[PDB]
Design an enzyme around this catalytic site. Sequence first.
Site, PDB file in Angstrom:
ATOM      1  N   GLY A  12       0.820  -1.192   0.000  1.00 44.78           N
ATOM      2  CA  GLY A  12       0.000   0.000   0.000  1.00 44.78           C
ATOM      3  C   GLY A  12       0.856   1.245   0.000  1.00 44.78           C
ATOM      4  O   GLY A  12       2.070   1.176   0.300  1.00 44.78           O
ATOM      5  N   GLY A  14      -0.025   5.513   1.389  1.00 50.28           N
ATOM      6  CA  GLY A  14      -0.841   6.636   1.808  1.00 50.28           C
ATOM      7  C   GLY A  14      -0.133   7.942   1.471  1.00 50.28           C
ATOM      8  O   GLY A  14       0.949   7.951   0.864  1.00 50.28           O
ATOM      9  N   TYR A  16       1.147   9.815   3.579  1.00 50.58           N
ATOM     10  CA  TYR A  16       2.278   9.940   4.498  1.00 50.58           C
ATOM     11  C   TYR A  16       3.064   8.657   4.802  1.00 50.58           C
ATOM     12  O   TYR A  16       3.906   8.659   5.685  1.00 50.58           O
ATOM     13  CB  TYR A  16       1.803  10.515   5.831  1.00 50.58           C
ATOM     14  CG  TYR A  16       0.712   9.708   6.499  1.00 50.58           C
ATOM     15  CD1 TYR A  16       0.963   8.440   7.032  1.00 50.58           C
ATOM     16  CD2 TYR A  16      -0.571  10.225   6.617  1.00 50.58           C
ATOM     17  CE1 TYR A  16      -0.039   7.711   7.647  1.00 50.58           C
ATOM     18  CE2 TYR A  16      -1.579   9.505   7.239  1.00 50.58           C
ATOM     19  CZ  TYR A  16      -1.312   8.251   7.753  1.00 50.58           C
ATOM     20  OH  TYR A  16      -2.338   7.551   8.364  1.00 50.58           O
ATOM     21  N   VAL A  18       4.189   4.261   3.500  1.00 53.91           N
ATOM     22  CA  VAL A  18       4.163   3.094   2.622  1.00 53.91           C
ATOM     23  C   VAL A  18       3.937   1.889   3.531  1.00 53.91           C
ATOM     24  O   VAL A  18       4.280   1.926   4.695  1.00 53.91           O
ATOM     25  CB  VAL A  18       5.476   2.930   1.861  1.00 53.91           C
ATOM     26  CG1 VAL A  18       6.629   2.910   2.832  1.00 53.91           C
ATOM     27  CG2 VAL A  18       5.457   1.659   1.013  1.00 53.91           C
ATOM     28  N   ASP A 121     -11.989   7.586   8.468  1.00 53.38           N
ATOM     29  CA  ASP A 121     -11.683   7.443   7.030  1.00 53.38           C
ATOM     30  C   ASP A 121     -11.944   6.031   6.515  1.00 53.38           C
ATOM     31  O   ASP A 121     -11.117   5.422   5.838  1.00 53.38           O
ATOM     32  CB  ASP A 121     -10.229   7.877   6.763  1.00 53.38           C
ATOM     33  CG  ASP A 121      -9.931   8.072   5.277  1.00 53.38           C
ATOM     34  OD1 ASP A 121     -10.866   8.338   4.464  1.00 53.38           O
ATOM     35  OD2 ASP A 121      -8.766   7.911   4.883  1.00 53.38           O
ATOM     36  N   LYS A 123     -12.989   3.151   4.128  1.00 50.70           N
ATOM     37  CA  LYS A 123     -13.045   3.019   2.675  1.00 50.70           C
ATOM     38  C   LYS A 123     -12.692   1.580   2.349  1.00 50.70           C
ATOM     39  O   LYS A 123     -12.128   0.888   3.195  1.00 50.70           O
ATOM     40  CB  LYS A 123     -12.096   4.010   1.996  1.00 50.70           C
ATOM     41  CG  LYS A 123     -10.668   3.955   2.375  1.00 50.70           C
ATOM     42  CD  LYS A 123     -10.047   5.287   1.946  1.00 50.70           C
ATOM     43  CE  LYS A 123      -8.776   5.518   2.664  1.00 50.70           C
ATOM     44  NZ  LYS A 123      -8.086   6.749   2.129  1.00 50.70           N
TER      45      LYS A 123
END
EC number: 2.7.11.22
Length: 282
Positions: A12, A14, A16, A18, A121, A123
């Site tokens: 992944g 983001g 800010y 990894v 958040d 998702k």
Amino acid sequence: AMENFQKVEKIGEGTYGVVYKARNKLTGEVVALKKIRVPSTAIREISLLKELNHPNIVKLLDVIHTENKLYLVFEFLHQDLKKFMDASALTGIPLPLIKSYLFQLLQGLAFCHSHRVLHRDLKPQNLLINTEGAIKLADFGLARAEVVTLWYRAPEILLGCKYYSTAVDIWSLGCIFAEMVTRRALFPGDSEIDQLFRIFRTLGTPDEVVWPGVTSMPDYKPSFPKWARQDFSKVVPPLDEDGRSLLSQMLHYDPNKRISAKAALAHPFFQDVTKPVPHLRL
Ligand SMILES: Cn1nccc1Nc1nccc(-c2ccn([C@H](CO)c3ccc(Cl)c(F)c3)c(=O)c2)n1
């Protein structure tokens, strides 16, 4: 510190950090290693998260704060719900599995919320699944602690409320429920105003009747266009009436009217809930 971990592959990123799949050279464990980028307030919040353990929350195994950098070591799961939805899109996820996943995530949320911890958040990429039929919340508590997706944002956040509540997580989960059922995102906005106006085009522009206080919210404008509401029968066909009634309560505009996780668990939609096992190709 990190010398204890052997990176296997990237899973992944983001805005800010990894995330790597990695092996604990010490314990033989396979883990997800999140490398962030340290403010003390962040250290103490993250430490509190280590205690927030539940079968439907991805376990935070270790927090390593070292060479003044921050690594979070998580339980590794083999797939996220975004990949599983894409994999399932010709046929759809079977309703009993949708229902099991929704019920489990509501259990996760009820636990977090009872400890006054918001996710903020939710998702599909943060919902991780395994072969046994479990689904778990990831990234939990990390917000209060690479375009950002707005699709699952509650309207009180989009309207500029700073002090929002656990209800924002129920809104996001309602949006994900609808997306499981229809195999399309419910509100795929590509800017903050596009997100807000996609919500208003489907659920009606909110007013003081349905959401007392709304016209005084920080980013509310009297000039917002006024769209009428649509029927859920048009929005998530062919979900049955129990599922539509539950979704409607999870998508109430007024966060104080929106159903809690604990109340949602008692909803008649879950009277026949079961725990099927997914077909996972790994
Ligand atoms: C194999 N596979 N495929 C997909 C997921 C997995 N496995 C897995 N196992 C445990 C944890 C995680 C995991 C993933 C992504 N994220 C977010 C995704 O939004 C994330 C936030 C913040 C930043 Cl900075 C980031 F890089 C990634 C997690 O927090 C945590 N993934």
